[PDB]
Amino acid sequence: QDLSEALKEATKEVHIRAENSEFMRNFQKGQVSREGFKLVMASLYHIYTALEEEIERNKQNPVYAPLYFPEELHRRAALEQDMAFWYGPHWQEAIPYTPATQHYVKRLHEVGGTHPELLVAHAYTRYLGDLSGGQVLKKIAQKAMALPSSGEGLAFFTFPSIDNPTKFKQLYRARMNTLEMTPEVKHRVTEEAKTAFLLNIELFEELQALLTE
Ligand code: HEM
């Protein structure tokens, strides 16, 4: 079975559970507010920072290299623009770093530093979602919070180097299928993707509790 398919099948159940996290339900209904949005986006800033440090560490390693798309996909510089927008000029000392965000970042460095053959699972789980549900969430955010169509504060959701997310996702899947694949790597990559999804769910469960505490 192709890696792209194995991953879709392996993660289709937990995707359902992730898209119905309470935080995401509230978000999708349009009950997202500045405070909650700031929290989630600050947490993503740390997550993508760690993911992309690890992509850079492993960019020439053939277990990852065919998925190396910094110009199209990487989110850190976008997140920095967003953090300056939502948190101001001293955002770096303002932004929170939650325990569930730390947990995710920790696993990211373990994968990038020790199990780089699994790094694809983590790039898959975040980037392809950003090009899918992330586009729906962006429209909702804009409406709920009165964000301007010019993009300020939602640079994370904006991919100026990708003309067509659907066609890009297709390119990316096909490229995943060119990685060197053995049953051991395939098994473990799809397991790590389920883990990635759980790390995301845990983040959201946490952020939701913080907002109701
Ligand atoms: C409200 C929340 C969400 C909605 C409405 C949503 C919606 C979608 C939709 C409609 C697709 C299909 C795209 C396609 O076939 O090209 C998709 C794919 C994806 N989503 Fe989400 N999603 C949400 C949350 C999540 C979260 C939290 C993650 C990960 C943490 C995520 C990760 C993915 C991945 C990795 C894919 C691609 C699956 C594949 O094609 O193999 N999504 N999502």
Swiss-Prot record:
Annotated Gene Ontology cellular component terms: caveola; cytosol; endoplasmic reticulum; endoplasmic reticulum membrane; nucleus; perinuclear region of cytoplasm
This protein's domain notes: The transmembrane domain is necessary for its oligomerization.
Protein's name according to its UniProt entry: Heme oxygenase 1
Family the entry assigns: Belongs to the heme oxygenase family.
Topological domain ranges for the Cytoplasmic compartment: 1-213
Parent-protein residues present: 11 to 223 of 289
The entry's keywords: Apoptosis, Endoplasmic reticulum, Heme, Iron, Membrane, Metal-binding, Oxidoreductase, Phosphoprotein, Transmembrane, Transmembrane helix
Subunit (UniProt): Homodimer and higher order homooligomer. Oligomerization is crucial for its stability and function in the endoplasmic reticulum. Interacts with FLVCR2; this interaction is potentiated in the presence of heme.
Record carries keyword Phosphoprotein: yes
One example of a Gene Ontology biological process annotation: response to hypoxia
EC number(s) given by UniProt: 1.14.14.18
Membrane topology term: Single-pass type IV membrane protein
A molecular-function term among this protein's GO annotations: enzyme binding
Subcellular location: Endoplasmic reticulum membrane
Annotated catalysed reactions: heme b + 3 reduced [NADPH--hemoprotein reductase] + 3 O2 = biliverdin IXalpha + CO + Fe(2+) + 3 oxidized [NADPH--hemoprotein reductase] + 3 H2O + H(+)
Post-translational modification summary for this protein: A soluble form arises by proteolytic removal of the membrane anchor.
Site feature location: Important for catalytic activity: D130
Gene induction: Induced by its substrate heme and CoCl2.
Native organism: Rattus norvegicus (Rat)
